[PDB]
Write an enzyme that holds these catalytic residues in place. Structure first.
Site, PDB file in Angstrom:
ATOM      1  N   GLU A  90      30.316   0.701  -5.145  1.00 60.21           N
ATOM      2  CA  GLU A  90      30.979   1.445  -4.123  1.00 60.21           C
ATOM      3  C   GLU A  90      30.522   1.292  -2.734  1.00 60.21           C
ATOM      4  O   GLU A  90      31.261   0.960  -1.846  1.00 60.21           O
ATOM      5  CB  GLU A  90      31.007   2.880  -4.494  1.00 60.21           C
ATOM      6  CG  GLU A  90      31.481   2.929  -5.936  1.00 60.21           C
ATOM      7  CD  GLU A  90      31.740   4.329  -6.275  1.00 60.21           C
ATOM      8  OE1 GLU A  90      31.402   5.212  -5.457  1.00 60.21           O
ATOM      9  OE2 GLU A  90      32.290   4.584  -7.375  1.00 60.21           O
ATOM     10  N   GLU A 140      -4.269  -5.799  -3.579  1.00 61.25           N
ATOM     11  CA  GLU A 140      -5.552  -5.269  -3.186  1.00 61.25           C
ATOM     12  C   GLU A 140      -5.831  -4.079  -3.959  1.00 61.25           C
ATOM     13  O   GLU A 140      -5.248  -3.051  -3.728  1.00 61.25           O
ATOM     14  CB  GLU A 140      -5.513  -4.907  -1.706  1.00 61.25           C
ATOM     15  CG  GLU A 140      -6.315  -3.708  -1.120  1.00 61.25           C
ATOM     16  CD  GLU A 140      -7.375  -4.043  -0.076  1.00 61.25           C
ATOM     17  OE1 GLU A 140      -8.359  -3.259  -0.012  1.00 61.25           O
ATOM     18  OE2 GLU A 140      -7.280  -5.051   0.667  1.00 61.25           O
ATOM     19  N   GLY A 147      -0.172  -3.940   3.698  1.00 59.43           N
ATOM     20  CA  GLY A 147      -0.998  -5.030   3.264  1.00 59.43           C
ATOM     21  C   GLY A 147      -0.123  -6.150   2.952  1.00 59.43           C
ATOM     22  O   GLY A 147       0.129  -7.008   3.771  1.00 59.43           O
ATOM     23  N   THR A 148       0.545  -6.091   1.819  1.00 57.69           N
ATOM     24  CA  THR A 148       1.299  -7.208   1.271  1.00 57.69           C
ATOM     25  C   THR A 148       2.403  -7.783   2.064  1.00 57.69           C
ATOM     26  O   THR A 148       2.744  -8.937   1.943  1.00 57.69           O
ATOM     27  CB  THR A 148       1.905  -6.878  -0.043  1.00 57.69           C
ATOM     28  OG1 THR A 148       2.704  -5.726   0.009  1.00 57.69           O
ATOM     29  CG2 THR A 148       0.783  -6.534  -0.991  1.00 57.69           C
ATOM     30  N   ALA A 175      -5.664  -8.578   0.768  1.00 55.45           N
ATOM     31  CA  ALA A 175      -4.381  -8.087   1.002  1.00 55.45           C
ATOM     32  C   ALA A 175      -3.837  -8.637   2.229  1.00 55.45           C
ATOM     33  O   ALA A 175      -2.889  -8.095   2.728  1.00 55.45           O
ATOM     34  CB  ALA A 175      -4.551  -6.605   1.241  1.00 55.45           C
ATOM     35  N   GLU A 208       2.003  -4.689  13.746  1.00 56.21           N
ATOM     36  CA  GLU A 208       3.306  -4.289  13.351  1.00 56.21           C
ATOM     37  C   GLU A 208       4.271  -5.180  13.981  1.00 56.21           C
ATOM     38  O   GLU A 208       4.910  -5.874  13.239  1.00 56.21           O
ATOM     39  CB  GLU A 208       3.475  -2.816  13.548  1.00 56.21           C
ATOM     40  CG  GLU A 208       2.950  -2.083  12.303  1.00 56.21           C
ATOM     41  CD  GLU A 208       3.004  -0.558  12.381  1.00 56.21           C
ATOM     42  OE1 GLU A 208       3.180   0.088  11.315  1.00 56.21           O
ATOM     43  OE2 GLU A 208       2.795  -0.008  13.488  1.00 56.21           O
ATOM     44  N   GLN A 252       0.868  -1.184   0.000  1.00 58.65           N
ATOM     45  CA  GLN A 252       0.000   0.000   0.000  1.00 58.65           C
ATOM     46  C   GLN A 252       0.847   1.155   0.000  1.00 58.65           C
ATOM     47  O   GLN A 252       0.782   2.032  -0.814  1.00 58.65           O
ATOM     48  CB  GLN A 252      -1.128   0.223   1.073  1.00 58.65           C
ATOM     49  CG  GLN A 252      -1.380  -0.929   2.032  1.00 58.65           C
ATOM     50  CD  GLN A 252      -0.172  -1.000   2.881  1.00 58.65           C
ATOM     51  OE1 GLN A 252       0.792  -1.679   2.578  1.00 58.65           O
ATOM     52  NE2 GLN A 252      -0.154  -0.232   3.968  1.00 58.65           N
ATOM     53  N   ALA A 253       1.694   1.176   0.979  1.00 58.33           N
ATOM     54  CA  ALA A 253       2.739   2.135   1.121  1.00 58.33           C
ATOM     55  C   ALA A 253       3.635   2.309  -0.031  1.00 58.33           C
ATOM     56  O   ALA A 253       3.724   3.356  -0.647  1.00 58.33           O
ATOM     57  CB  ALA A 253       3.560   1.630   2.297  1.00 58.33           C
ATOM     58  N   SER A 306       7.352  -2.100   2.453  1.00 58.73           N
ATOM     59  CA  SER A 306       7.066  -1.431   3.683  1.00 58.73           C
ATOM     60  C   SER A 306       6.843  -2.376   4.756  1.00 58.73           C
ATOM     61  O   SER A 306       6.273  -3.402   4.508  1.00 58.73           O
ATOM     62  CB  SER A 306       5.830  -0.624   3.476  1.00 58.73           C
ATOM     63  OG  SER A 306       6.073   0.184   2.340  1.00 58.73           O
TER      64      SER A 306
END
EC number: 3.6.5.-
Lengths: 130, 412, 426
Positions: B227, B44, B117-118, B72, B156, B10-11, B113
């Site tokens: 690098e 979603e 959702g995912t 989702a 979370e 979503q993010a 993220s």
């Protein structure tokens, strides 16, 4: 002596097997839409032990979801060993798989092992007149 | 040469959506000419759905906005195994039509993220499937990682302790932002009190143009994606910068004479202007990349760094004695109208590998504990073909990455 | 991804009738079924809730269930009555013969099929099924008996979706119905096994909120009903518009329940202003939370305040500084830090959709999952046991072919569940 001998202290062991289990472990399990394969083989093993005909996950949800799932377990025969052929079936089917393996399941959920222990008892007592 | 990009979650798509705008402004692309070179994946529809409609209909060839249509999740497991499994293929295919549309890229800017959702789980299986099919390339993920307080979900913690082990071993270098820590910046240094998920995204879209985009404009002393993997890692483990950008200020704290080179560099070390609640005060730094861009002349820098090099609040770590880099590019940052930064003349992105992120790792390991400590919310994951393993082993694992990022401090 | 109503029973019809009043209006749809809105966005997701019919009239996908049949001659009498497509209405002729058993063997037990039929024919006319909302009361005939049967068929044919149930619990001190505890208790046992998201609304708590928070003189069953529908458009429908952060139906649920005993929620709506008395220009977000967490803006029995919340989920919906929300919520988690559960580590699940509900300028549904819901099932269970104790009405039940033993069962069972909720009152 007053002993049966053949599987004797297995049937005092199988006795722990019924006294372990807790209803809330079932209630979460029966909610599980698609738990891992480690759950799945154990549930096919209970379904055979209670002697429902063999199944597969879709069908198993439909079955387990019933009111009397937990009730039949609590109502069951711990002293059953009267001629099930479910012993020779379950052995050809499952006690020949090393993925039917105590540990894998033993971690699996909360107390899935105690359920595996219960099935294992129902098999290892079923060795009753061997 | 140029370089595909995958936003999952979503993010991640929102992040894209801003960020991809800026790009296009940057080179002077209209909303049409050549065609963007990256992908958006999600289970979603609604997010991607905006994208198919809002201006910028054109400017993707519609192959590459793959959208699922089933759920989702909002819970890893499902998104990794169960549902997401269906989509994988189909995504995987586009980037393989897309790899071979072009020569010699270097890697995949993922933006995915750590809540959404995912997109712990899914990403988990994506970075993993890339890692086998393209074992060589570079995998920079900019992940968004959940604040010490301002969490907006009750899983979370479950998602992020599950994610680490998938990113630890398989993404090359993983950047961290956090939403909470961004908030200060918008309030104080910019001076707005409306900072939507939409404002912050305009921001990260600036820190990214300064890594890559800009390097591709070639300036004076240029730095490059390999690098890093030399200069910021310093061991094996996937090590994690934190990003900081420098002159953030708004268009009327603009007038207060130049932002001297000397200043902006000094303004980075300030632990109230970084981006991830952590604060480097007791961190040891271990490695920096200061990328400047705009009129910054090597000397200036090479003086201003000296001052820092002696500021002594700020500690470099013993077993390195050096540690810098410098990017100078030309191209003076470009300024998205619907954003809020001034017409600056040069800015400085220092990203750097610090033992401070011992902090950030803590909170979440902690949060998690409480919840796992009862078992609490487990059933949504267990039941999706994901295991009791994954809980225990993704904590015990991440603890044992966390002693390393402390031990590699201080012991010489 | 799209979803399917089931309106069993008297209330269960009645609420319905407003809900499709709402929902329709949030997509510019006439009474007829043709769209006349403004902004394409309205019309983008009709599918969740509709079916497109030929010509262009989108007819709501509901099922209208009842064991008597003047009910239905009122629902179609309505002002937004044309809409349904006649084939949907499954009446019976018995009467809501106000015995749960009669609605769950016997008269409803017969009718079931003429409903499942319409559900499969409805289910397979849409793409991806999401869940069913089942609306109904633990009050009338058809509601607790017959609808609690209904789900037991659904949850065996479609055994994965979610199932929202909006039940209008038997409002303690504003009852009708001398059998209440028989009619409630038998169904709650059945709900707690098989639906995954259940919302208790109670008429007097519901009342309350209308004469004092609104300041309405005369709260019509109709008004009340009208208020209930806003919480139900507000949960779902909203996420079937765009967003910022976007939770949803699976998610909402999938963020609450800390173990699996279904868990019943409590809705709270949020910018209620009493008419003339509140044109004090003052909408932000500190008020929306201010309101919401206030123990007299619960639509359901108890006051939160005697227990904890376990999870909370605030689904806001208009323009906003997504920060100032995310903050606010925080403060709330700290000022009342006392009772919010100290072993789940954050509670709120914010979601924020993005269009206002019609006249307003932002609204925000609250779905609290409190341990205070011990204090409803005690109440109910009490009245039961006490009156069961002398067998004391039992026969309008026994005689429909159910034993006594169910009356034991259900109580025990259901009572034990209250126990669970108290364990997390700790």
């Amino acid at each position: 002596m007053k002993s049966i001998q053949d599987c004797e202290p297995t049937i005092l062991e199988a006795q722990r097997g019924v006294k372990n289990i807790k209803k809330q472990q079932l209630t979460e399990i029966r909610s599980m839409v698609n738990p891992p394969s480690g759950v799945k083989i154990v549930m096919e093993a209970v379904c055979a032990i209670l002697g429902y005909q063999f199944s597969n996950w879709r069908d198993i949800q439909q079955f387990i979801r019933k009111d009397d799932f937990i009730h039949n377990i609590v109502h069951y025969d711990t002293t059953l060993h009267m001629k099930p052929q479910i012993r020779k079936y379950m052995e050809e089917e499952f006690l020949s798989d090393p993925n039917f393996t105590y540990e894998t399941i033993n971690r699996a959920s909360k107390a899935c092992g105690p359920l595996y222990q219960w099935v294992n008892a129902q098999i290892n007592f079923s060795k009753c007149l061997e | 040469r140029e370089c595909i990009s995958i936003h999952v979650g979503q993010a991640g798509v929102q992040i894209g959506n801003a960020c991809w705008e800026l790009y296009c402004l940057e080179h002077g692309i209209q909303p049409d000419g050549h065609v963007p070179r990256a992908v958006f994946v999600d289970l979603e529809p609604t997010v991607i759905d905006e994208v198919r409609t809002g201006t910028y209909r054109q400017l993707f060839h519609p192959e590459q906005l793959i959208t699922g249509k089933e759920d989702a999740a909002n819970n890893y497991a499902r998104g990794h195994y169960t549902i997401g499994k269906e989509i994988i293929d189909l995504v995987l295919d586009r980037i393989r039509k897309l790899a071979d549309q072009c020569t010699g890229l270097q890697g995949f800017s993922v933006f995915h993220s750590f809540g959404g959702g995912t997109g712990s789980g899914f990403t988990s299986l994506l970075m993993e499937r890339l890692s086998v099919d393209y074992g060589k390339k570079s995998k920079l993920e900019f992940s968004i990682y959940p604040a010490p307080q301002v969490s907006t979900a009750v899983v979370e913690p479950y998602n992020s302790i599950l994610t680490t082990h998938t990113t630890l071993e398989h993404s090359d270098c993983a950047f961290m932002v956090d939403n909470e820590a961004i908030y200060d910046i918008c309030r104080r240094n910019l001076d707005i009190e409306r900072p939507t998920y939409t404002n912050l995204n305009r921001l990260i879209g600036q820190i990214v143009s300064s890594i890559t985009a800009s390097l591709r404009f070639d300036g004076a002393l240029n730095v490059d994606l390999t690098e890093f993997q030399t200069n910021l890692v310093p061991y094996p483990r996937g090590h994690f910068p934190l990003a900081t950008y420098a002159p953030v200020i708004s268009a009327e704290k603009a007038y207060h004479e130049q932002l001297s080179v000397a200043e902006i560099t000094n303004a980075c070390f300030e632990p109230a202007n970084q981006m991830v609640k952590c604060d480097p005060r007791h961190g040891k730094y271990m490695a920096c990349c200061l990328l400047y861009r705009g009129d910054v002349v090597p000397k200036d820098v090479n003086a201003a760094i000296a001052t820092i090099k002696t500021k002594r609040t700020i500690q470099f770590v013993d077993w390195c004695p050096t540690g810098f880099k410098v990017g100078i590019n030309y191209e003076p940052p470009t300024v998205v109208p619907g954003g809020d930064l001034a017409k600056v003349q040069r800015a400085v992105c220092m990203l750097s590998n610090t033992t401070a992120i011992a902090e950030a790792w803590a909170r979440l390991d902690h949060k998690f504990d409480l919840m796992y400590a009862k078992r609490a919310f487990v059933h949504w994951y267990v039941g999706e073909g994901m295991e009791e393993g994954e809980f225990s082993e993704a904590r015990e694992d991440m603890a044992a990455l966390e002693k390393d990022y402390e031990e590699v401090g201080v012991d010489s | 991804r799209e979803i399917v109503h089931i309106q069993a029973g008297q209330c269960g019809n009645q609420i319905g009738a407003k809900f499709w009043e709402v929902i329709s209006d949030e997509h510019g749809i006439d009474p007829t079924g043709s769209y006349h809105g403004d902004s394409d966005l309205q019309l983008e997701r009709i599918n969740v809730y509709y079916n497109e019919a030929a010509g262009n009239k989108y007819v709501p996908r509901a099922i209208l269930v009842d064991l008597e049949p003047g009910t239905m001659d009122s629902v179609r009498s309505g002002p937004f009555g044309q809409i349904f497509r006649p084939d949907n209405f499954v009446f019976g002729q018995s009467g809501a013969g106000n015995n749960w058993a009669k609605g769950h063997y016997t008269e409803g037990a017969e009718l079931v099929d003429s409903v499942l039929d319409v559900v499969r024919k409805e289910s397979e006319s849409c793409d991806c099924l999401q869940g069913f909302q089942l609306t109904h009361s633990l009050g009338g005939g058809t509601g607790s008996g017959m609808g609690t049967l209904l789900i037991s068929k659904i949850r065996e044919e479609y055994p994965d979706r979610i199932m929202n149930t909006f039940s209008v619990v038997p409002s303690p001190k504003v009852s009708d119905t001398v059998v209440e505890p028989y009619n409630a208790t038998l169904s709650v046992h059945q709900l707690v096994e098989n639906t995954d998201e259940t919302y208790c609304i109670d008429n007097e708590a519901l009342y309350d909120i209308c004469f004092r928070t609104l300041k309405l003189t005369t709260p019509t069953y109709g008004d009340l009903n009208h208020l209930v529908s806003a919480t139900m458009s507000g949960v779902t429908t909203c996420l079937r518009f765009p967003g910022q952060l976007n939770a949803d139906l699976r998610k909402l649920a999938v963020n609450m329940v800390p173990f699996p005993r279904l868990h019943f929620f409590m809705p709270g709506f949020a910018p209620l202003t009493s008419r003339g008395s509140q044109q004090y220009r003052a909408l932000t977000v500190p008020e929306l939370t201010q309101q919401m967490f206030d123990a007299k803006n619960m639509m359901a029995a108890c006051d939160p305040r005697h227990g904890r919340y376990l999870t909370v989920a605030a689904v806001f919906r208009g323009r906003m500084s997504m920060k100032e929300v995310d903050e606010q919520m925080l403060n709330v988690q700290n000022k009342n830090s006392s009772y919010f559960v100290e072993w789940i580590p954050n509670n709120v699940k914010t979601a924020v959709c993005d269009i206002p509900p019609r006249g307003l300028k932002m609204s925000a549904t609250f779905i609290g999952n409190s341990t205070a819901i011990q204090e409803l099932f005690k109440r109910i269970s009490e009245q039961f046991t006490a009156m069961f104790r002398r067998k004391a009405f039992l026969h309008w039940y026994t005689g429909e072919g159910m034993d006594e033993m169910e009356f034991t069962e259900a109580e025990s069972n259901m009572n034990d569940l209250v126990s669970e909720y108290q364990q997390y009152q700790d």
